[PDB]
Amino acid sequence: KVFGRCELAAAMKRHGLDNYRGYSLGNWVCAAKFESNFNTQATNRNTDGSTDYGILQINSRWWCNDGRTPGSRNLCNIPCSALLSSDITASVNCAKKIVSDGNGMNAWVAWRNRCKGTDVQAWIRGCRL
Ligand SMILES: [Cl-]
Ligand SMILES: [Cl-]
Ligand code: NA
Ligand code: NA
């Protein structure tokens, strides 16, 4: 599924991400835009052999099991394919574990480079929330 901007904002709000660990909703929407272009089916392979999955591009070296990343942890205890669903619940629940691990949203390279320090409220402007 490819989400609309306000549709995703609303879905993330219902799932408890607005101000989760102090990150306002616009941060999560901005990160999704530049990680996946709001496409739940997005996958990208990394140089080390791991792969990133879903709307928030969660990596198989630490967070999920894809059966092909040797030595990986599955810290979210989920197959990586569950992260590609039109239902964002599994991605959101895993993202909450990631953002709580010490480095906040700096875990997402595109957030650090394209959202951090910008007017992220613009990503939810106009939405009925
Ligand atoms: Cl915001
Ligand atoms: Cl980047
Ligand atoms: Na929309
Ligand atoms: Na893994």
Q: Which ligand is nearest to the CA of 71?
A: 4
Active-site annotation holds for 35: yes
List the domain boundaries for the chain. 1-129
**Method used experimentally:** X-ray
The one catalytic residue among 18, 48, 52, 119: 52
Farthest-apart Cα atoms in the chain, separation: 45
Domain 1-129 sits in CATH 1.10.530.10: yes
18 is in an annotated binding site: no
CA of 70 to the centre of ligand 2 (A): 26
CA distances from 36 to 11, 43, 113 (A): 16, 8, 15
Please compute Rg for the chain using Cα positions. Answer: 14
Active-site annotation holds for 7: no
